[PDB]
From Swiss-Prot, chain A:
Piezo comes from the Greek 'piesi' meaning pressure. The lineage of its organism: Eukaryota, Metazoa, Chordata, Craniata, Vertebrata. The gene is PIEZO1. This is Piezo-type mechanosensitive ion channel component 1. Expressed in numerous tissues. In normal brain, expressed exclusively in neurons, not in astrocytes. In Alzheimer disease brains, expressed in about half of the activated astrocytes located around classical senile plaques. In Parkinson disease substantia nigra, not detected in melanin-containing neurons nor in activated astrocytes. Expressed in erythrocytes (at protein level). Expressed in myoblasts (at protein level). Changing E123Q: Found in Er(4-) blood group phenotype. It is linked to Dehydrated hereditary stomatocytosis 1 with or without pseudohyperkalemia and/or perinatal edema: An autosomal dominant hemolytic anemia characterized by primary erythrocyte dehydration. DHS erythrocytes exhibit decreased total cation and potassium content that are not accompanied by a proportional net gain of sodium and water. DHS patients typically exhibit mild to moderate compensated hemolytic anemia, with an increased erythrocyte mean corpuscular hemoglobin concentration and a decreased osmotic fragility, both of which reflect cellular dehydration. Lymphatic malformation 6: A form of primary lymphedema, a disease characterized by swelling of body parts due to developmental anomalies and functional defects of the lymphatic system. Patients with lymphedema may suffer from recurrent local infections. LMPHM6 is an autosomal recessive, severe form manifesting as generalized lymphatic dysplasia. Homotrimer; the homotrimer forms a propeller-shaped Piezo channel with a cation-ion conducting pore. Heterotrimeric interaction may occur between PIEZO1 and PIEZO2. Interacts with PKD2. Interacts with STOML3. Interacts with TMC1, TMC2, PCDH15 and CIB2; the interaction may be part of the MET complex. Interacts with MDFIC (via C-terminus); the interaction prolongs Piezo channel inactivation. Interacts with MDFI (via C-terminus); the interaction prolongs Piezo channel inactivation. It comes from Homo sapiens.
Length: 141, 48
């Protein structure tokens, strides 16, 4: 992130009352050999980041200097997606009833280990091995 | 990216109204058609 806008991103999470667009685009590029017009089935699962929420205060400290903040993203990792040959990664409703609150609790961890060496691990609220390998599912069509 | 509104479209059309074909392009394209290219210029991405 460009330094001035990184400081502005900081500020948003720090104070700036805005809602960061957390578009979790779930692009599913298939193929065209077996068919699949718009193979890439994509859906930006956005999470408007409430100004300085629990998640954004964790992100405030994340971008302040520390790298030990588990950012709570309220169940936003679709664990069952009815994707077809069109451009939509729409999750199965009922599989995930709330489908925004029944996806899968996802967490984020920026690992700025100055040596800032800013990495970014996508953890889970219950990360067992899903900090390096998140296992969701795509109900393909 | 800003989908230009009806009022915004009028502005562009009037800006280039002297030139007939310029205005024509804008006016012919339906409102909420002409989109705004607000391309980001800030970097951060160093180069390689």
């Amino acid at each position: 992130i460009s330094p001035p806008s990184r400081a502005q991103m900081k500020r948003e999470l720090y104070n700036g009352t805005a809602d960061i667009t957390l578009r979790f685009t779930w692009n599913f590029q298939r193929d065209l050999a077996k068919g699949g017009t718009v193979e890439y089935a994509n859906e930006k699962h956005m999470l408007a980041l409430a100004p300085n929420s629990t998640a954004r205060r964790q992100l405030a400290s994340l971008l302040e200097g520390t790298s030990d903040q588990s950012v709570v993203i309220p169940n936003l990792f679709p664990k069952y997606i009815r994707a077809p040959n069109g451009p939509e990664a729409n999750p199965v409703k009922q599989l995930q009833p709330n489908e925004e609150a029944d996806y899968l609790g996802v967490r984020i961890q920026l690992r700025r280990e100055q040596g800032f060496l800013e990495w970014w691990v996508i953890e889970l609220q219950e990360c067992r091995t899903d900090c390096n390998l998140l296992p969701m599912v795509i109900f393909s069509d | 990216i800003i989908p230009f509104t009806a009022q915004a479209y009028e502005e562009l059309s009037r800006q280039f109204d002297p030139q007939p074909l310029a205005m024509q392009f804008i006016s012919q394209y339906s409102p909420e058609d002409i989109v705004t290219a607000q391309i980001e210029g800030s970097s951060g991405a160093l180069w390689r």
